[PDB]
A and B are shown apart, each in its own frame.
With several copies, the nearest count.
Chain A
């Protein structure tokens, strides 16, 4: 209503499962554009995780299927 506004964030997915050093991620669909400007659509890259106090760093490993759904697998290497 007044001036104060809070949220400004731009991600590409959200964590959906943890299986003993192995992370599952679901990729967004309804976003007309994931533009903010960098986009990650390929294995080998590095991704980050906002845990409120620290930043956790991981590394992409796989992509596959199953408006359908897309999934990604990653592994963790350290924190900042």
Chain B
């Protein structure tokens, strides 16, 4: 259920390990699409169901003529959504060049529908997305405990925690604003908010505070947009909803470059994307520092770039990771029988290492977000040696 360095480990030693791992110089977390299921979010398996239920003729067009999707793969709900966007884009580009009119419209429709379905799954609150004080509801309860626990375990003179994520939704911002804490994400201004790469080198100081962190969104956001002038701006939820989100959701208008998000396999196709590169440079610079710890939760292990990066950080003899994977044994067995997908081979390769710096957790529902948060400890205020207390119980043990 819990493995370290290939061997098996027990619960008490795991708790003692987790406690002493939070005293190091660097602490960070990387969250995925599963960490927001308890708030109103969805996964990539539900998007395919929604697509195949709402649009029943485009599915037949995909299956019969172009042969992009097979029948059995669609029946079992085992078709990758990211790998289909790239193929559709390739077909559209080829058709456009040779001046074909009829075959150019269908792929436009497919891309518009597939982009619309992805957007709906990130609001988390439906039409209530435009209101205010959305962090006061009971759903955003464990995000607050996560931030409080992370931020209170910081001795003076150290560095603030860092958070990476691949969601488009505003869960962390809603949680932190209701709590009163500030996060730095590279933007500045109110009437004209712009992206500045050098805004990641700042910090607070007291004129005569101390509660803040950083936030990196690797695959873009739902309130970001580019006005084609090689600048990127950020606005509020209500302004974005009144500007473009509502038209996409309801008016079924054709999709354009309203907001920059990155669903797809190859992220290097876009050439003028200078935020993705900055985010990944800052991510790659974080894991090369000595005395670092990282906790991974909700990540499905299906991205080439990210797990390509993770493997290269195990050549440093001061790096530690803890990985939460619910369905570990099913991945364990399928590999011995011939192998599963590329997603399930990576975790099995990671587990079977021989370094006492990789820990993998499994166990179904005991490796969830709520289970994750409660494992983190609270600071000890007013520490004391307490030697005489153990002397007293070492009296009582013989008194037994």
Contacts and interface: CB of A to CB of B under 8 A. Distances in A.
Q: Indicate if A touches B (C-beta under 8 A).
A: yes
A1 B188 CA distance: 10
Contacts of A37: 356
Interface in B156-214: 188, 196, 198-199, 201-202
Contacts of A2: 188, 196, 198-199
Interface in A32-73: 32-33, 35, 37
B356 A35 contact: yes
Q: Chain A interface: which size bin?
A: under 10
B20 interface: yes
15 contacts: A1-B196, A1-B198, A1-B199, A1-B201, A1-B202, A2-B188, A2-B196, A2-B198, A2-B199, A32-B23, A32-B24, A32-B291, A33-B20, A35-B356, A37-B356
Contacts of B202: 1
Secondary structure of the B contact surface, majority rule: mixed
Contacts of B201: 1
A9 to B, nearest CB: 12
Contacts of B356: 35, 37
Interface of B: 20, 23-24, 188, 196, 198-199, 201-202, 291, 356
A35 B201 CA distance: 31
Nearest to B189: A2
List 6 A-B pairs, minimum CB-CB distance, nearest first.
Answer: A1-B199, A1-B198, A1-B202, A2-B196, A2-B188, A35-B356
Contacts of A1: 196, 198-199, 201-202
Nearest to B200: A1
B66 to A, nearest CB: 47
Given A1-B198, A1-B199, 13 more contacts: A1-B196, A1-B201, A1-B202, A2-B188, A2-B196, A2-B198, A2-B199, A32-B23, A32-B24, A32-B291, A33-B20, A35-B356, A37-B356
A1 to B, nearest CB: 4
A35 B320 CA distance: 13
A1 B186 CA distance: 10
A33 B16 CA distance: 13
A2 B20 CA distance: 34
Interface in A2-28: 2
Nearest to A8: B317
